[PDB]
């Protein structure tokens, strides 16, 4: 075979069954990522996401070099480029990791027709998720589970997730390496941010370095004693948790730099070491399982990220409020907790889950009454771990738009922050114009006596904006609106 392995997610060598399929019996293997650099033509994506991808690609290329090969980065779009690629390279097999996401599936079906037309074999393997999602759906009467509880019931009756696949052999690769030309970089090289047209003046090291090598190091650290105890054995929220963690895995999971199956098993194995003669609870895997739940929900729903025409979504008459949406996106709400979180997100590409809940509540049902759809869009742009399934699903969950929500109240834009970080140091860090404020006022600086504002060297409404809404009034009206909306839902 002359094989091509197409990277999309699954940006790793480890736990890559599709790659193994490409390699077996091949005369030549080429690994490709098809990159569309025409930014203007597509929804905006932030620098943090682009950089993470490029770094992930650099890492793969680096790893491939160890196998005497290279990454082929091909510029363009897949449907546009594949037919030429098949001819020019004489490909007989194409492999990739399966994509459950509805747009992804659609794209993939089209490529599969093209491949057939060209007499190219296609092998796909599901390694993005723990389980075979279609199986979960099948067991459920051919519809996705719409509660986490039902979802847990379904997997509970199922076989365990497959173990991570064996690594590709160095020698297996070497038996099939492709001719690398010495002009390779010009045509197939991994671009730099500068090259793609991003401004890099004064851009320091990424908070979340891309790639498989980083991801593997993080996993090992994640399972060392200190992280294990804090994460799993005795977990409690604290202010320091707000900060990006050297053991955070979520971006790596999103990009496929880290296998979910590897994480799941490494975690189980650690649990067994720690805990004698017990089987773990499902909650041990909760971060993964919530991810699976949303993927399962998404896969058959092309309208998943939309309100109107989405079968699982409550129809709610959201405000169109462009100015408000803009202030939220830019961290200029005048609520320092909300502003600080939005600042961290824009700057770094990750925020804590509780932080996401806070800003999402504020945008939607809590304060602004703007559609969750707008929130999804912003997160899509800025948030490293925000894919189609998890992002939309979470937003709909939070906003009480889907997944059967026996209500819980929205977080207070002031109280929650103060509770989460009483010191106020998180605010001081991300909104240093407010660093002067004492802790008692840093979350609600508008309430500070004028002498306080002056000592702080920050006059509210001059050096930092006033709060854009009155929370107590707004929340009261909103809570009533939500109650009315539920009341007006047909009961059965
Ligand atoms: C539903 S849950 O019980 O609270 N839990 C589900 C989960 C755990 C791991 C993956 O999902 C936390 C998520 O909701 C946190 N989260 C996101 C996680 C990834 C991408 C976007 C978001 C997002 C957007 C808005 C509000 C919260 C958000």
From Swiss-Prot:
Modified sites of kind Phosphoserine: 69, 245, 278
Domain of life: Eukaryota
Lineage: Eukaryota, Metazoa, Chordata, Craniata, Vertebrata
Main subcellular location of this protein, as a coarse class: cytoplasm
Phosphoprotein among keywords: yes
Residues reported to bind FAD: 250, 287, 353, 385-387
Function: Transcriptional repressor which forms a core component of the circadian clock. The circadian clock, an internal time-keeping system, regulates various physiological processes through the generation of approximately 24 hour circadian rhythms in gene expression, which are translated into rhythms in metabolism and behavior. It is derived from the Latin roots 'circa' (about) and 'diem' (day) and acts as an important regulator of a wide array of physiological functions including metabolism, sleep, body temperature, blood pressure, endocrine, immune, cardiovascular, and renal function.
Cofactor dependency: FAD; (6R)-5,10-methylene-5,6,7,8-tetrahydrofolate
Complex formation: Component of the circadian core oscillator, which includes the CRY proteins, CLOCK or NPAS2, BMAL1 or BMAL2, CSNK1D and/or CSNK1E, TIMELESS, and the PER proteins. Interacts with TIMELESS. Interacts directly with PER1, PER2 and PER3; interaction with PER2 inhibits its ubiquitination and vice versa. Interacts with CLOCK-BMAL1. Interacts with BMAL1. Interacts with CLOCK. Interacts with NFIL3. Interacts with FBXL3 and FBXL21. FBXL3, PER2 and the cofactor FAD compete for overlapping binding sites. FBXL3 cannot bind CRY2 that interacts already with PER2 or that contains bound FAD.
Positions spanned in the full protein: 21 to 512 of 592
Activity modulation comment: KL001 (N-[3-(9H-carbazol-9-yl)-2-hydroxypropyl]-N-(2-furanylmethyl)-methanesulfonamide) binds to CRY1 and stabilizes it by inhibiting FBXL3- and ubiquitin-dependent degradation of CRY1 resulting in lengthening of the circadian periods. KL001-mediated CRY1 stabilization can inhibit glucagon-induced gluconeogenesis in primary hepatocytes.
Consequence of substituting residue 356 to A: Impairs protein folding. Abolishes binding of BMAL1, PER1 and FBXL3. Strongly reduces SKP1 binding
Effect ascribed to mutating residue 331 to D: Loss of ability to inhibit CLOCK-BMAL1-mediated transcriptional activity. No loss of ability to inhibit NR1I2 transcriptional activity
Glycyl lysine isopeptide (Lys-Gly) (interchain with G-Cter in ubiquitin) crosslink residues: 9, 105, 221, 327, 454, 483
UniProt effect for mutating residue 334 to D: Loss of ability to inhibit CLOCK-BMAL1-mediated transcriptional activity. No loss of ability to inhibit NR1I2 transcriptional activity
GO MF annotations in UniProt: damaged DNA binding; FAD binding; kinase binding; nuclear receptor binding; phosphatase binding; photoreceptor activity; protein kinase binding; protein phosphatase inhibitor activity
Post-translational note: Phosphorylation on Ser-245 by MAPK is important for the inhibition of CLOCK-BMAL1-mediated transcriptional activity. Phosphorylation by CSKNE requires interaction with PER1 or PER2.
Protein name in UniProt: Cryptochrome-2
Organism annotation: Mus musculus (Mouse)
Knocked-out gene: effects: Animals show longer circadian periods. Double knockouts of CRY1 and CRY2 show slightly decrease body weight and lose the cycling rhythmicity of feeding behavior, energy expenditure and glucocorticorids expression. Glucose homeostasis is severely disrupted and animals exhibit elevated blood glucose in response to acute feeding after an overnight fast as well as severely impaired glucose clearance in a glucose tolerance test. When challenged with high-fat diet, animals rapidly gain weight and surpass that of wild-type mice, despite displaying hypophagia.
Tissue specificity of this protein: Expression in the retina is restricted to the photoreceptor layer (at protein level). Expressed in all tissues examined including heart, brain, spleen, lung, liver, skeletal muscle, kidney and testis. Weak expression in spleen.
Induction of the gene: Shows no clear circadian oscillation pattern in testis, cerebellum nor liver. In skeletal muscle, under constant darkness and 12 hours light:12 hours dark conditions, levels peak between ZT6 and ZT9.
Keywords of the record: Biological rhythms, Chromophore, Cytoplasm, FAD, Flavoprotein, Isopeptide bond, Nucleotide-binding, Nucleus, Phosphoprotein, Photoreceptor protein, Receptor, Repressor, Sensory transduction, Transcription, Transcription regulation, Ubl conjugation
GO terms for cellular component: Cry-Per complex; cytosol; extracellular region; mitochondrion; nuclear speck; nucleoplasm; nucleus
